[PDB]
Amino acid sequence: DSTECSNLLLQYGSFCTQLNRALTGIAVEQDKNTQEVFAQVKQIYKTPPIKDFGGFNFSQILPDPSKSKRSFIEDLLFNKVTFNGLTVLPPLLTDEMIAQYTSALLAGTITSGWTFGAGAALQIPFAMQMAYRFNGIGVTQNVLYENQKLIANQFNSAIGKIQDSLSSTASALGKLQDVVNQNAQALNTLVKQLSSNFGAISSVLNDILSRLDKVEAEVQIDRLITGRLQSLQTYVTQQLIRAAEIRASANLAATKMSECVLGQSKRVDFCGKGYHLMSFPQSAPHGVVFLHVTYVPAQEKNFTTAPAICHDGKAHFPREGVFVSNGTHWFVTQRNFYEPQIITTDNTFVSGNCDVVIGIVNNTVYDP
Amino acid sequence: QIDRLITGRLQSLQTYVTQQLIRAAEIRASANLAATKMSECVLGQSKRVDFCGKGYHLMSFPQSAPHGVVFLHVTYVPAQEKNFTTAPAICHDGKAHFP
Amino acid sequence: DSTECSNLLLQYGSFCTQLNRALTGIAVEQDKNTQEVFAQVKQIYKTPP
Amino acid sequence: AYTNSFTRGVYYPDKVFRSSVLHSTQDLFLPFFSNVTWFHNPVLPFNDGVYFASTEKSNIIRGWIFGTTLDSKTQSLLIVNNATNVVIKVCEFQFCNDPFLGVNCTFEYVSFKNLREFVFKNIDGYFKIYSKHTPINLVRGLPQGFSALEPLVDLPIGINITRFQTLLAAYYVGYLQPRTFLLKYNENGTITDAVDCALDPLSE
C-alpha cells in the first residue's frame, strides 16, 4: 500500500491481473473437484428408524445425530487432519453439506445396493444385496446365507479395527495432512520473501523512501518490485502444478465413487485387495476415505484335478467350477470356495470323445 | 533501455509458455479419457458404473465437435417399480432352494 | 564456488532453497512411481524346477 | 590455560519479541563446545568481538579497556564499576602498562557461588554490551547449562577496536564467530534453548 511503488507497478501492465486470473481458475476448480466427487447422488436418501441390516452393523459409519452431523469414523478423520494481500476463500460446500452427501451415498448403498446409481433407488434386504454381491465375485449365494452370522461378525469386527487404526495413530492420513502442509509451506515461503532485499539497499519499502531521493529511490524500489513479482510468479506456477496433481486425485476419487460406492467393481485391485464386495465413503478434511469391503479366500487345501472326465467314451467338462479329487472320489466344486458336488449331467456338459483332451480321467458321471 | 524491454518481453513470453505447458497437460488428460471412452464405450460395452453416462450402458456413438468429441451414450434406465414381499430361499421337502 | 557471488545470492532469500526442495520432491517421486508398478506382489514367488 | 564452553554465550540478537516459536538467525555468536581461554592480566586481541565470563561473587574484577593502542595516541574505551554502578569514558588515556585496583574525551556515561557473563561487540559505529548473572556450583570450568544474555547498552561512540584487557578468581575469554543459530523462544519471549547449526550433522 505504498503509493510511490504503485505508480511503478503499473509499468509492468497485465502481469498482476493474470496472477489473479490464474489463482481464480485454481480456486473455482477446487469446488468443481469437490462437487464431482460427492454430488453423484440426485436425491438425499436417508436411513430408516429400524436397523435390521441382516446382522451387519453400520453404526460407526452412519451419521451420529448427537454430534457437525458426521459419523463416528468421520469425526476421527476430522480430528486427525490438523495477510500481506494474501487471502483464503471458503469452499462452496461446508463440511456439514459434504457429510450430507456421504450420508446420502451411504444410506442409498445400504438400503438399495447398486440400483440408486442406475436410476430410482430400489429397496432390497441387506442379506439379499450381499448375495448378489457374492454372485458378482463368482461365489454362489448359498455360501452367504449358510454363513451369514459369520460374515456379519467378520464385517462388524473389521469396522471395529478401523476405529482402532484411526484412534491409536494419525499416521494413516499422511496423504491429506501433506496437502495441508504443502499449502502452509508455500504461503509461509511467499510471505518470507517480503523480508528479502533482491539486491536493494533495504527490504523495508518506506526505509528506501527515507534514505534516498526520488530518482535513486525508484531504482532501488524496482528491485523489490522485480523480486516480489518473480516471487508471486514462482508461487502461482507452483500452485498451478499442485492443482493439476489434486485434480488428477479428485478424478480418481470421483471414479472410485462411481465404480465402487454406486456399483461393484470387477477391476482387480482397484477397490481394495481381494474380490470387491462394496465400499462406503466417509469424508475427511480436503479429501475422501473409502472403506472397501472385500472377500479374501483364507484356508486352501491341495486337491488332484483333471480338465475333463471321460464317461461312456464322452468327455464331460464342468459348466461352472472345476473337477477335484479328495483322494479316491471325484467331485465338482465352484472355483472360489470348497463346496463339493457329486458329478452329474446337470453339473457338466459333453464335447466329443476322450482322445482329443490332454489329461482327461476315467470316472463315473451320474444321470438323475 | 532495450535490456528492460527484452527482460519484460522475455518474462512475458516465459509466463505464456509455462501456462500453455500446464494447459496442454490438462487437455492431454482429457484426450486420454476420450480415447478410453471410445475404446470402452463405443468399441465395447462398459460394465463400469456411470463411466458411459447414467443407467446401465447399452452402447454409445461418437460425434465430432470442434476441438473435442461428443458421445451419445445409450443406456437402459429402470422406470416403473412395484413393491413385493421377498425371501432369500424357499423350504420345499426339508431342503432349501435358491434362485 | 565463488565466495563473493554466494553472499549476493543470499539476498534473494528462499529462491535457491525452494529449487533444491522442488528437485528433491521430483527425485523421491521416481522411487514411489517405480514401487507402485512393480512392488504389487507380496512375496518373491518362484517357478517350479 | 583453556576450557570447554558447553552451550554458553547466546544473547538476544535484536530487540524483537518472538514467542512459542523457533527463529533462525546469523550473527556474531560464541560457537558451542568452543575451547575458550581461561585466566586467574594480559592484553588480548578483540577479533570480531568477545564473550567474557567470571566467577564474580568477590569484586576482584573492576573493569575493562578496549582500543587499538590502549595508550595516548588515540581514544580508547575505559569501563569501570565505581562499586555503585558502571562508569564509561572514551579518552586518549596515557594510563599504566600494568594497571591495578586494590583487592581529551569525546563521550562519557554512567549506569564462588555466582557467574557474571558479558558479550562485547562493535558494529558500524556502535559498541554493544549484553550480560547475565547466575548462581553456580563449580569453581574450575564454565557451568554446563543454558541461559541467554540480555542487552545493557548500545553506545554511539564511533571508535575502532582491535585489542582489549581486564582491570582487577577464575574468568574466561572466547571469540564470537559469524555463526548461524536456531533459537527456541518460549511463551514469555525468553530464549530457552539454541542449536549451533554448524556444530554437527544433526545440528545441521
Add this chain to the structure above:
Amino acid sequence: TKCTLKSFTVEKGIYQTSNFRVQPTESIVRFPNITNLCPFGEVFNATRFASVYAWNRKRISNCVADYSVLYNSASFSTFKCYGVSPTKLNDLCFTNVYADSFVIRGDEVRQIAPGQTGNIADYNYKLPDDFTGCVIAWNSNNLDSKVGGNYNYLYRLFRKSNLKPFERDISTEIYQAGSTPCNGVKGFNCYFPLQSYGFQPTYGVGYQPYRVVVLSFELLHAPATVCGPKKSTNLVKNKCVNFNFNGLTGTGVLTESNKKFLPFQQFGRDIADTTDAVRDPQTLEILDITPCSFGGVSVITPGTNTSNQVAVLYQGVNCTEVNVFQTRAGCLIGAEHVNNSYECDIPIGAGICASYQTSQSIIAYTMSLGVENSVAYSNNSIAIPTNFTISVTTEILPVSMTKTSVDCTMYICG
C-alpha cells in the same frame, strides 16, 4: 465490472472487480520522552564570556538540539543561518556541533559571515565560503561595558597572515609593523598585536558590546550524536491509523494486548517475520497491531442483457467495517436474504448462492443439495422395475488446443 473485464457487455456470474481496504483515519507519531536538551545555556546565558582574539568553543554532542529555543528568542539583536533555513534545523542530524563564542563591538558583528574580510574575520575568527551553520548575536552592554571603559576585552590588531577557516591563534608575540627589527622587545613600528574596545556605557549602538555565537555542523562515519527534537502525537487505539514508533512506520489497528515483552524488547513479530505488536515509548504498554480491514470485492450480477441490478460481496469483511447480510464468505450487500433453498445459480461460498428471481431482484440463499428421500427399506421388501426407458446422454470432452508457434525473436525484437 465493465472496466475490470475491459468490455461493455457483462454475462451472468460473480466477478472480483476490486479490493476493499479501510483507509487510515489519521497518522500518528511516537518517540521517547524528549530528554538531554543540548547545553546551549552555557553559551547563550552564562555570566562569563571570551575575548575575540581567544574565543571559546563548546563542543555539542549526545543531545537534542532544539534550535527553535535559539531562533525564536526575540531578545537577540541578530539571527542568520547559512546552508539551512531556521525552520529546517530541527529536522537535521549531525555527528558533532560546535558553538564558537566571543564579545565584539556591534560594527564588527557584520564581519561574522562566510568568506568576508575585516579585523575579526581575517585575524581572530575566519569562516569558510561553504560554511553550513548559524550566526547569532545579542547586545551585552549590561555585562560587557563599564564606567570609565571595560578594557578587559581584546581583539587582534596585527598578524603576519590571514587565518585559515577555523584556525585558532592566541599568541601575544610582538609584531614588526615596518623596517624595525624587534629583537624580542617593543619599539617604534614594533607593537603589541592586540587592542581593546574599552567598552563604555556612553558608547553608541555600533561601538557597544555584543555577545556572539557561531554554530558549526558536521556529519562523519561516527553516528549522529546530535539531532533536532522529535515531535510526537497522542495515541489512538481501536481505530485504523497510520503509525510510527521511533522508525517503525506502518498502517493498522492498535489495541492493548496480553503480550509480555522483556524490558529491552520494543517490537513483536509473527511466525513469517510480519510485525504484530509494539511497546509505546512514552508509557510502556504492549500494543497489538492487526492490518486495517481489507478483502476482494466481488460483483454478483445477472447477465446485463437481462438486468443492470448488482449485489456486492466484500470477501471476509464483516459488515460493521464497510438489503445487507453477513454471509460466512463476507458481507453481502444489495441482495435479499431468502428463507427457501434452491439449486446453486451463482456461487458465493460457505453454502450460500445467489440468483435473479421474483418484480425481480438478486436473492441470496443456502443452496439445496437435492430432494430428501426415505427409501422404503424393510428386511423382506424388494422393489422390482416393471418397465424401462432407453435414455440417450450427451457427454462432451475436449481433445486438442489451438496449435500455436511464436517467433521469440519477432515478438521480443520486431
